[model samples]
Target: GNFYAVRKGRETGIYNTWNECKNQVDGYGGAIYKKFNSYEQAKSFLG
Candidate 1:
């Protein structure tokens, strides 16, 4: 599944759009995120 992910410390979540992903980190600190072509990649990215 093509989607974006947010990796904020111990939190990782899937998002359908890039905009939504960015919204999650608004005014956030220590937030790290990116898009992945596959769901597995997003999961492993934080793992």
Candidate 2:
């Protein structure tokens, strides 16, 4: 499944796989974070 690195209610990174997304957030500790199965879903939440 696809995953995203969301911060401040916006999509910051679009990761094709979950591991990549998880790794990014794991290193950076700040702002709100969320996971989405699709980019559309992430964008919808931001809007």
Candidate 3:
């Protein structure tokens, strides 16, 4: 699965797939912040 980084409100998290990330975003009624192929990419973006 592709990795993803999402921001919901002021919270951020890494997910194993787009769907997982989307779920959290939906729960918070927020938007998808970013998509990544690896943890490194997500971490770099967050940093």
Candidate 4:
């Protein structure tokens, strides 16, 4: 499965698809996003 570590302003989380992550931060400001193969790795990306 794919994982995306997405951050928009104060919101941060991981989603399975790019579109899902995009929609989450659609109305927000600030930005940082990345994709990884492992969910654990994606979670660590926030660290």
Candidate 1, 1-47: lDDT as tens digits? 34766766554586666566666656676667666766687767756
- Model 3 per-residue lDDT tens digits across residues 1-47: 56777664565677776567565554554475677888788878767
> For model 3, what is the alpha-carbon lDDT of residue 18?
55
Put down candidate 4 lDDT per residue, 1-47, tens digits, no spaces.
Answer: 35677765465678786566557555555556666667688888878
The global Cα lDDT (0 to 1) of model 4 is: 0.67
Candidate 2 stretches greater than 4 Å from native: 8-14, 27-31
- How would the candidate models be sorted by lDDT, starting from the highest? 4, 3, 1, 2
Clashing pairs in 3: none
Measured on C-alpha atoms, candidate 1 has an lDDT of: 0.64
> Which of the two candidates, 1 or 3, achieves a greater lDDT against the reference?
3
Return the lDDT, model 4, position 38.
Answer: 71
> Which candidate, 1 or 2, would have the higher lDDT against the true structure?
1
TM-score of the candidate numbered 3?
A: 0.59
Compute each candidate's TM-score over C-alphas: 0.46, 0.51, 0.59, 0.53
Every model's Cα RMSD, please? Answer: 3.6, 3.7, 3.0, 3.4
The number of clashing residue pairs in model 4 is 0
Off by over 4 Å in 1: 9-12, 25-31
Model 4 residue 5 CA deviation in Å: 0.6
Cα lDDT computed for each candidate against the true fold: 0.64, 0.61, 0.67, 0.67
Cα lDDT, model 3, residue 43: 70
